[PDB]
Amino acid sequence: ALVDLCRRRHFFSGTPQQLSTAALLSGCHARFGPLGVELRKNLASQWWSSMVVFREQVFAVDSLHQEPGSSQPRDSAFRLVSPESIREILLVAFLENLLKTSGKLRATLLHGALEHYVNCLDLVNRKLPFGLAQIGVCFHPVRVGEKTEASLVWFTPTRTSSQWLDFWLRHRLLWWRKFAMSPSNFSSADCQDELGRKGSKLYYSFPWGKEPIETLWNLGDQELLHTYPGNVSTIQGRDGRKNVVPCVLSVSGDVDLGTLAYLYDSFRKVLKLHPCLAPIKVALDVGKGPTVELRQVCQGLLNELLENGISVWPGYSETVHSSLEQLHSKYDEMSVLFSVLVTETTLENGLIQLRSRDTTMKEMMHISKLRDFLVKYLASASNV
Amino acid sequence: EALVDLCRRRHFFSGTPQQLSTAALLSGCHARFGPLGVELRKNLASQWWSSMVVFREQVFAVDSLHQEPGSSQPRDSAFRLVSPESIRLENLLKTSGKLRATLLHGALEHYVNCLDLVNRKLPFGLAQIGVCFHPVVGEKTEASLVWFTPTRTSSQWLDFWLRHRLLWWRKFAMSPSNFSSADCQDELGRKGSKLYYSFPWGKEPIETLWNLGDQELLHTYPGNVSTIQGRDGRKNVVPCVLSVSGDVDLGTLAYLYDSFRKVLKLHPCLAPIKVALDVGKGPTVELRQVCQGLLNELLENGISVWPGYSETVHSSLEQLHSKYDEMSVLFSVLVTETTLENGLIQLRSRDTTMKEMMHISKLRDFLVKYLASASN
Amino acid sequence: QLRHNPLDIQMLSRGLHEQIFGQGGEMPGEAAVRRSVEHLQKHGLWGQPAVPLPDVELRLPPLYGDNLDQHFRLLAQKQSLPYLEAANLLLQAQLPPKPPAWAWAEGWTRYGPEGEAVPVAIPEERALVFDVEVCLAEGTCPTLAVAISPSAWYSWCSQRLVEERYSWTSQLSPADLIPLEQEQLVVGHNVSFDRAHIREQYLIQGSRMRFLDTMSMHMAISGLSSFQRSLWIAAKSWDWLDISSVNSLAEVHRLYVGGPPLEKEPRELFVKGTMKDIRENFQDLMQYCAQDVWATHEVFQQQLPLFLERCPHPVTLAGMLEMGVSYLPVNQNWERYLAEAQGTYEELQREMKKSLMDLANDACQLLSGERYKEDPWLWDLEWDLQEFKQKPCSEEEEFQQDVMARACLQKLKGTTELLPKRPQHLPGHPGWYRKLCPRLDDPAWTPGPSLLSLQMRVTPKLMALTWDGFPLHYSERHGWGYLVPGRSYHHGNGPYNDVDIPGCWFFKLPHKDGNSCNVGSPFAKDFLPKMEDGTLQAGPGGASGPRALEINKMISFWRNAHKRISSQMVVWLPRSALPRAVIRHPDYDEEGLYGAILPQVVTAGTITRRAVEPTWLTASNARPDRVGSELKAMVQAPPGYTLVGADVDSQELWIAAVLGDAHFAGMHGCTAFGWMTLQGRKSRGTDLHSKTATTVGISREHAKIFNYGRIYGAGQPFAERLLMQFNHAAEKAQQMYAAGGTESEMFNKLESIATSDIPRTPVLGCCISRALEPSAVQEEFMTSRVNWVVQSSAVDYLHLMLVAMKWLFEEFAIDGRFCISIHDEVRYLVREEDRYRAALALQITNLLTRCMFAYKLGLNDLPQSVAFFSAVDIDRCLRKEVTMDCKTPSNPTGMERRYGIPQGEALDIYQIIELTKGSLEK
DNA sequence: CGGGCTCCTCTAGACTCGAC
DNA sequence: GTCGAGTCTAGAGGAGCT
Ligand SMILES: Nc1ccn([C@H]2C[C@H](O)[C@@H](COP(=O)(O)OP(=O)(O)OP(=O)(O)O)O2)c(=O)n1
Ligand SMILES: [Ca+2]
């Protein structure tokens, strides 16, 4: 199954009981190993580029994990209590003071973006529309569950709010289907907020059900209203020559759930993660002797590759020996794009044995051409 | 102008003036980095990640949960988590979870899995960048490398890591003399040393190396020694835990003080914004098309472009140049009407302030070469 | 056993004296004793009491012959007999004609008559004339070689030449060298270079093959001083031009043989080409190498008899043959030393380069508004500027907008027809700035002014260096200086009005060599005391200036020597080549590396016949503030071996003293200078070095320089310069030189030897070079000729020491071998079981050599003061002092901690006697 | 007249070769 | 054709040793 494959290849992490579907969705533990962390980092980096680097007027946002707290009844998030204050007492007044003054953990990134709205408003010269994007950890009760929510808060005038919502919906669907091995597994749906506001949700057809990996809401100016009860002039943005309080559009996703989706979609037992998402792209090993000189050659090649941003797995440093087919199967499980083998013939004429995961067909390439070929392949995968 | 005022002006800093005080900045209880500051911190984190994991043999990533198990240790001062619905007191200290104060606990929890990944072959390390919570609640982004040295070479690897950390911190610095190290011991008499940066108020320990023993690893594993005994050479040896912890929030503050006409001479591999694009007189449409094409070409290569052609506010060349200087923009590209005729664009460098012409075909290659050779 | 001379000087122990000189002898007579007593009374040395040193009794080896001179002659004849026999084979041999075409096989090829090419394993000849050609591109590895032997022509082709591969191992091994090997004589023009590429020369155990050098014999016979080679090249009294030439092979050939001029390949493909060029131009290169070998053999034919005519004593050749077999062992810590020294050098270079480049970048901003004309440091640079020379949107809408912009960009990327072929190098930067930056197409390009350094002529202007309140300025005629404005109120090296800077006076910086020399860079080590004194200061202030000078001092040796040290041809022995002692020793590292470096010493590479070497004879001693100074300490004996060695105490001082005493009377201490030399001890701080060091107030190492300079033709200018430097005066110099005098007899003896018709060394009678004899030069180069008398007597001392040490090592079967001999030191790699035997052998060798120096002069005795070494070091790494720890900037924890090398022991004669029971046998 | 060497970097100069 | 960039080569000063 996929759970065993991801756990044994360090994509998943934790105890076998923590590998349950409910435990994975809750996020009450470290559910991703080093390869899972690398894959999630690649997914976050691709999201950042697609929606903050290659986008117009979208800026970085990073805020505190804690919140000031307002003792609202709906605030079910956990509270921060100082151990010294408890130890000083060691009861109604203490509990009232805790519920009144203890800060709570953030459940969504929307409020942090709304707090950061003013400075980013000044940065863009108050020119609407503009967006705020953030990737961070959000805390929700199951102990406490943590989700690596990646959300974009788009500030748009009242005009073209639904148009911008549909634009974002189609762009998010395209972005999620860009890396998808089976893009039909991603589906959008219509939904309505509890307050009657319209919105949309993005599913992924997991084997158990269509979990919402991303949700869109037309929240409007109500949220901006409370976060700023002061003067309107510090709230309203500029739309052309007019001034209007922007409508807040919430576009929030889950890169932990998205990473699980891309682990299920990208599934001998071989993962076929997109080249822009794969954690390990080149595997460098070594054949027979002379080991001392072939290891120097591999060290030079590895130093050349790492200087150009290509992630490499130094398989040549492992003293454990095994057949080449087992190594190739292991690399396929770890989603290695290309496996490079340096042999005696490499010293004589510079030819190395290059294997592609997608074809299982071998090739002979000169040493000097390996870096250029890898860079060209990665660029072609990224652009298309 | 003061450094804090300039960084707040150019969005390296955030918060209210009361939060821009030295004590407030050192506390970490509030969001202190603006957009450019967050980008600079991400650049510093990426440089640390590359130098300590990508180019380091057998150093691996790890991601730990923000909360430690809720054990009733009297010495712990970490804030506790309480569910408001349970309220709507001894049990809180008895079982409620606590926010982590250091990344060492997560590294020790993941020590077994990383042993399995490396075939238990010592030496090896765990590296992590993440938020650690300290009572003051203050939050610090700790970049910690926990190196499991075999007991035979504890001091040798400790000295090597101290030298490597000092070199890494000095590499990006305009004044390597400000970074210094001094040997120190803790309450239990453990050997170690602390790196410092000579802030205008005094040395701050941006990085500390502690020569822990096997006791710190036995704390999280009160069981069979065979499950935690690494494979050093031929004989199984319980590793010597070194805690190389570096604060990248205080590190970014140190580099903002170190870099600082008013110009932030940030390292080319640290600066948030590297290329700025502009426009000429006319025609506007063709210049905008050229700028859009050039910007799309630059972004695909991995160069952080700042589009200044889309700015509606008119500004003179001097104001634009000073603005790009304070934001630590490496190069400013100007596309004029002459570009449509022969492809020549005027390029300005932050380091020298000298303006030179270059054909539009060679710009991307020059920028890639400059950024690649600036790292070495 | 106590003995005293007529002058109450304690002489050699009776037991030793009766064996060295024997019972009997001739007393100097009453008249000589009266002379010496009056001379000592005049200088007040007669009444001083002498502290008796403990008696020494030894069973010395039985000296051969009727006396000591016969003993040394017999030793040297036995040593160098086979190599004179092999050398005479080449003089009388006739060579068959050179083959029309050379072979292209692997290994050695033997060319018989008519060009018959036969492959062989080794030349297998007692006498060879050798030349090795090395492709510099492929690193330090032999490419091809040509050998001349009686009735054969030999050629050797490397596997890296015949076979083509992408890469070869960068670590050299014996399997990658020239197999060339009961004694055998191999002759070359620079035979050290040809020796370094032989695989049999790197074995730890010694080998009998000895190497003779044609340029060594050229320097011995008709060598030229460095002041003479300059004049000889400029031209090409002057009667010496016809009997001398530079050590180049063609220059020597046109002199000794004088046939058709020798031809060389104009392209120089071995130094300025790749392996493909050599494989395609193979025949020309092989022919031009065979031509060089033939020229070398023809020169040797005329050089061998003349050297034996001018250097008749067998000791000279027997020592020259032994001085060319130096051998330095290393281990895996050599590679770590190279890596750490290079890393520290790069770190400090980057630390200084950051500041230098920051100053350069902050300097170019003065171009705007022409503010450089006001800068007191940069107003003289080039500030020119070069012109540039010439010959929501819809998805479909957004896609079209992207495509149109991309096509618009692509349109201009094709407008390169107006672009000049040669890319202009930074037209927009100032003139001085372009030279500081490498061109964009440079394979080694690095952003910013990466070429800037402290040695450049702009740095002292960029750093705004200031000497006592005045900005530094450079004059092409007078070197560095400073501009005192006001144009005479400043006292210094005098305002040179040649510069004629408007309104300023150019005062040269004070220099250690006086106002005759010009300052090259203000970052010299001499200015660090002036930097800390507050005279030399940097414009940015703070510690930037002092830190720059400290970094420059730390890396200055490595800056000049990293090319040599890194390129030292280290050959790492495999496990099969190491001796059993290294394998079985407890300190042996099974996963370590062991090898050796053969110094490329060209023995007698000086008119004084001193050996010279590019690196090892000039390697800096380990210092706590020098990067890479632990170089000699990295020469670490293998497991189971120790570096037993010793240093001669006041070698040339005592040689001059004994010469002056013998010229005066047949005793020791006849002259005041000799008495001062004898009555002293280094351990008590009363030797002739410290005796004057305390008087003037300098260190012992500076006392050596002061005394030796004063002895060797200092004259009045040197003394007056020293007096001015120490006391800011020729009358005091006259008084010093006057104090008939203390050293008058030594000077008289030296001038009598020098002005003789054929000057010769007093001990062994080796003649001076033909270019310095009075017949060739009428009273020219007098200081070089008089200094040659003592300095070549020191080489005779070294030859005697080498002969005696080899005799003792071979007779008593000491398992040690010669390691290296700097101009007065003799380091021997000795196995641990024989370290004390080696120490006793060194002490006995010094005793015998001092006694021979006395005997050849007719003194027939030796004092107890100078009879033995102060102490014989027994160390595991080659270092100056056994107790010294390096703690260099590239090695801060020291040899004890990092490399794990303990301290050694410096043992005097009595401890060695107690340990060995006064016997060398086991 | 301190000697006797070794090598390095830095810079001025004459020479060669290509480009418009 | 004339200009301008590479390319050795010579000398000078500094830094090691003895
Ligand atoms: N400035 C110098 C230094 C040395 N020498 C010569 C004279 C010495 O005999 C020989 C060896 O140098 P040392 O440094 O060993 O001089 P000493 O032998 O006098 O030193 P020590 O008595 O400590 O052995 O080199 C010289 O002529 N001028
Ligand atoms: Ca000496």
Numbering used by the authors:
A (entry chain C): 42 to 131, 141 to 192, 204 to 328, 343 to 459
B (entry chain B): 41 to 128, 145 to 192, 205 to 328, 343 to 458
C (entry chain A): 68 to 248, 262 to 316, 344 to 498, 532 to 627, 731 to 971, 978 to 988, 1051 to 1233
What wording appears in the published article?
The POLG gene encodes the 140 kDa POLγA subunit, which possesses polymerase, exonuclease, and lyase activities, while POLG2 encodes the 55 kDa POLγB subunit, which enhances DNA binding and processivity. With over 300 known variants, POLG mutations are the leading cause of mitochondrial disease linked to a single nuclear gene4. Cryogenic electron microscopy highlighted structural differences between human and mouse POLγ, particularly in the POLγB subunit, which may explain the higher activity of mouse POLγ and the reduced severity of mutations in mice.
While R conformers resembled their wild-type counterparts, E conformers revealed key distinctions. Strikingly, mPolγA paired with hPOLγB exhibited a reduced kcat compared to the complete mouse holoenzyme, while hPOLγA combined with mPolγB showed a modest but steady increase in activity.
